[PDB]
Amino acid sequence: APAEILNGKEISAQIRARLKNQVTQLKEQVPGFTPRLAILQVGNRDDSNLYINVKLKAAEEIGIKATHIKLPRTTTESEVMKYITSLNEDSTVHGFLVQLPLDSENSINTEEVINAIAPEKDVDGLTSINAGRLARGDLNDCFIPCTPKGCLELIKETGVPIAGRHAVVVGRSKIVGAPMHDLLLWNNATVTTCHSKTAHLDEEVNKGDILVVATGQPEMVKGEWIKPGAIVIDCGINYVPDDKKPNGRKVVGDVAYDEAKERASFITPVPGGVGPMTVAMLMQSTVESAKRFLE
Amino acid sequence: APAEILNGKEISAQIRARLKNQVTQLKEQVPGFTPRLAILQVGNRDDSNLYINVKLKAAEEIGIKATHIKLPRTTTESEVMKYITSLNEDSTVHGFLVQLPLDSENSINTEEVINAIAPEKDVDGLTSINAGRLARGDLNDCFIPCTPKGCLELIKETGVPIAGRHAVVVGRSKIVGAPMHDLLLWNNATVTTCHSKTAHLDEEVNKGDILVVATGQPEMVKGEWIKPGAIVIDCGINYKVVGDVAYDEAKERASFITPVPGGVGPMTVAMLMQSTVESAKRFLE
Ligand SMILES: NC(=O)c1ccc[n+]([C@@H]2O[C@H](COP(=O)([O-])OP(=O)(O)OC[C@H]3O[C@@H](n4cnc5c(N)ncnc54)[C@H](OP(=O)(O)O)[C@@H]3O)[C@@H](O)[C@H]2O)c1
Ligand SMILES: NC(=O)c1ccc[n+]([C@@H]2O[C@H](COP(=O)([O-])OP(=O)(O)OC[C@H]3O[C@@H](n4cnc5c(N)ncnc54)[C@H](OP(=O)(O)O)[C@@H]3O)[C@@H](O)[C@H]2O)c1
Ligand SMILES: Nc1nc(O)c2c(n1)NC[C@@H](CCc1ccc(C(=O)N[C@@H](CCC(=O)O)C(=O)O)cc1)C2
């Protein structure tokens, strides 16, 4: 009785298709309304160009007007700040994000930049104000970071109620771990957060009916650690050379999949689990912002 | 035989004496300068009145100038917003707070009212900005709620390091439970947060080397559930006055325990004063 596989690629395709339909209906219900996203980039990193082009492409297919603002490396902090203030003020933009990390020849305080974003437009959900709302239970209107939002969605796809269950989150980062605890807590699970200073991590992991691991340590969580029948969510994206693969490299998660799949009732594969879910989540957050403005 | 008693009244007395000397020196460095705190109240709840009096009394004894504004029960959210804006703009007021719960005959969104407060004066640490910083580990730039602060201080009085310990926080409110989890987490403990939807609560509480209870249910946490040698912090104030933990039983299992009264209560006001003296010192800098 091996674990059922949570196909992130398929589930995300479903999500994006439904969002397209919603966007089509919003525009027909309110003629002239145009859900709009904006991405602010500083510099010209190759990886950022790739990530951005993927976000813009997904936005255009759903019917969301996506605006890409690309500033040169010579940009200063005051200029980046000016754009954020203008994006906040632009009533035609419902949600925007600053693509990280910034690429400039000058010193720019990343935290001050991010925190200048108007909370009601913070689709990536990383501002302190938004993090503060999510941490204290304002799930009805705050924004949720794309990765943990995709994790909760995958957990809900199992059909197993979260309330009353014991969930373990290995990792406590701003991007994943912390907001993941927040989603699980406010969905009424009893949550235990682990990290690099956690003693007897194996014994802790073994107590989770729902397990979300986001550590960046390739396959550290062994199958033996998994609680029998648990829902395992693996956010890990670790590269390992493998000449038997088309591009000479494989992607493994933070969980030892092959042995964990024999213990859990539901498990996300890597690649193809949490990863494909992220862009869809940003698109969902964008639509949410558009609908809250429209109301 | 019983657990060591964490005397919050003696410890807070030492903190207050310390803060007093600090305030006295600040005035000697800058004569005429006076750290000022303001407490805004809506309504006339008897318990809120006594709580405010205690805070006013501790401020006076430390040398802090405290102002109490009491609004009638007919107050609207709009009017409360006018006082909050006035207090944000009043340069002589270094730190202010809105007494909770608001006692009005009209609906007033408490979060909107609290979030109108300027974060630099949010000595109660209830704004979404301060909550967000604490929630993500940015402890350099924020005010932490006075109750979780007092609890952390009480835990440190045991002399036992927090890092690596499995901590259990029973309760998740904005005032105590949620920020308490954060403080423990960022102090490197492995933290479990329990609430009303927690199944097998007795089994969860039994895993805690550090146990903080803030539920408001009279002596609901049984001593049987306590892990032998645990540090028990009890934030409960229930009506005789009792905590959220069955003290007589828990004291025979714990290594360190907070009594009620004279435990977390005093420490809470001492920490509020500490955050106030801090907001006055960040203003001079
Ligand atoms: N699907 C996507 O596109 C997506 C998006 C974001 C992230 N991810 C993946 O998620 C992973 C985690 O990212 P992150 O932002 O959370 O990074 P991070 O900032 O480095 O987070 C690591 C966290 O795990 C803890 N930790 C480190 N080693 C551990 C260990 N050996 N045992 C227990 N805990 C350990 C650390 O504790 P301390 O706080 O004490 O340091 C820290 O909280 C990365 O591999 C990344 O590839 C995927
Ligand atoms: N020392 C001080 O001066 C100070 C300052 C403030 C407060 N306190 C004290 O702290 C206590 C709690 O305050 P609060 O603002 O957090 O209260 P609250 O708003 O009523 O919150 C109680 C929390 O505990 C949970 N809970 C209720 N019954 C429970 C049960 N039987 N088992 C497990 N969890 C239960 C609730 O879960 P749900 O969210 O699911 O409902 C809720 O999260 C009060 O007794 C108060 O006197 C002390
Ligand atoms: N929501 C909310 N709930 C609360 O319980 C409070 C609050 N807000 N705001 C203010 C806060 C006041 C904190 C406080 C608690 C106890 C004491 C105190 O000194 N207690 C004495 C006993 C006093 C007596 O009743 O005679 C002690 O030794 O514990 C002082 C401040 C209470």
Name residue, tokens 């964008």.
A286
C-alpha angle B129-B132-B135 in degrees, rounded to nearest 5: 150
Q: Which CATH class is domain A30-118?
A: alpha beta
C-alpha angle A66-A127-A125 in degrees, rounded to nearest 5: 50
In one-letter notation, the amino acid at residue A284 is: Q
Residue B26 CB neighbours (<10 A): 17
Whole-angstrom Cα distance, residue A155 to residue A166?
Answer: 13
Residue B60 CB neighbours (<10 A): 11
What is the torsion angle, in degrees rounded to the nearest 10, for the CA atoms of residue A104, residue A107, residue A111 and residue A115?
A: -70
In one-letter notation, the amino acid at residue A11 is: I
Superfamily of domain A1-6+145-275, CATH level 4: NAD(P)-binding Rossmann-like Domain (3.40.50.720)
Residue in chain B lying closest to A174 (CA)? B136
Question: Smallest Cβ distance to A136: which of B136, B174, B193?
Answer: B174
Cβ atoms A284, A15 nearer than 8 A: yes
Q: Which CATH class is domain B1-6+145-265?
A: alpha beta
Locate all alpha helices (DSSP H) within A30-72, ordered by sequence: 46-62
> Under an 8 A CB cutoff, do B163 and A197 touch?
yes
Would you give the distance in Å from CA B218 to the centre of its chain? 19
- Structure-determination approach: X-ray
> Under an 8 A CB cutoff, do B193 and A185 touch?
yes
In one-letter notation, the amino acid at residue B264 is: V
A288 three-class SS: helix
Ligand 2 contacts CB of residue B175 (under 6 A): yes
Whole-angstrom Cα distance, residue B22 to residue B73?
Answer: 38
Cβ atoms B167, B210 nearer than 8 A: yes
Q: Residue B124: list chain A partners with CB under 8 A.
A: none
Whole-angstrom Cα distance, residue B250 to residue B233?
Answer: 11
CB distance from B163 to chain A under 8 Å? yes
Whole-angstrom Cα distance, residue A189 to residue A204?
Answer: 16
Domains A1-6+145-275 and A30-118 in one fold: yes
Number of H helices, E strands in chain A: 10, 11
Strand boundaries in A43-129, DSSP class E: 65-71, 95-98
C-alpha angle B231-B232-B237 in degrees, rounded to nearest 5: 160
Q: In chain B, positions 93-152, which contact chain A (CB-CB < 8 Å)?
A: 111, 127-133, 135-138
B251 noted as active-site residue: no
Whole-angstrom Cα distance, residue B199 to residue A209?
Answer: 13
In one-letter notation, the amino acid at residue B75 is: T
Kindly list the domain boundaries of chain B, sorted by start residue: 1-6+145-265, 30-118
Name residue, tokens 């699980």.
A184
Q: What residues have CB less than 8 Å from A35, skipping those under 6 apart?
A: A23, A26, A27, A63, A64, A65, A94, A286, A287, A290
Name residue, tokens 């308490």.
B180
> Under an 8 A CB cutoff, do B195 and A190 touch?
yes
Whole-angstrom Cα distance, residue A227 to residue B211?
Answer: 25
> Under an 8 A CB cutoff, do A198 and B204 touch?
no
Measured in degrees and rounded to the nearest 5, phi and psi for residue B15 equal -65, -45
Cβ atoms A280, A58 nearer than 8 A: yes
Ligand 2 contacts CB of residue B197 (under 6 A): yes
Q: What residues have CB less than 8 Å from A283, skipping those under 6 apart?
A: A15, A16, A19, A58, A59, A62, A64
CB distance from A193 to chain B under 8 Å? yes
C-alpha angle B199-B200-B204 in degrees, rounded to nearest 5: 105
CA neighbor of A93 nearest in space, from A24, A39, A131: A39
Q: Residue B137: list chain A partners with CB under 8 A.
A: 172, 174, 178
Resolution, angstroms, 1 dp: 2.2
CA neighbor of B155 nearest in space, from B204, B207, B195, B208: B208
Cβ atoms A149, A116 nearer than 8 A: no
Q: Which token pair is B120?
A: 């630099």
Q: Count A/B contacts: CB-CB distance under 8 Å.
A: 88
Cβ atoms A41, A69 nearer than 8 A: yes
A283 three-class SS: helix
Whole-angstrom Cα distance, residue A276 to residue A274?
Answer: 6
Among the bound ligands, the one closest to the CA of A136: 2
Among the bound ligands, the one closest to the CA of B201: 2
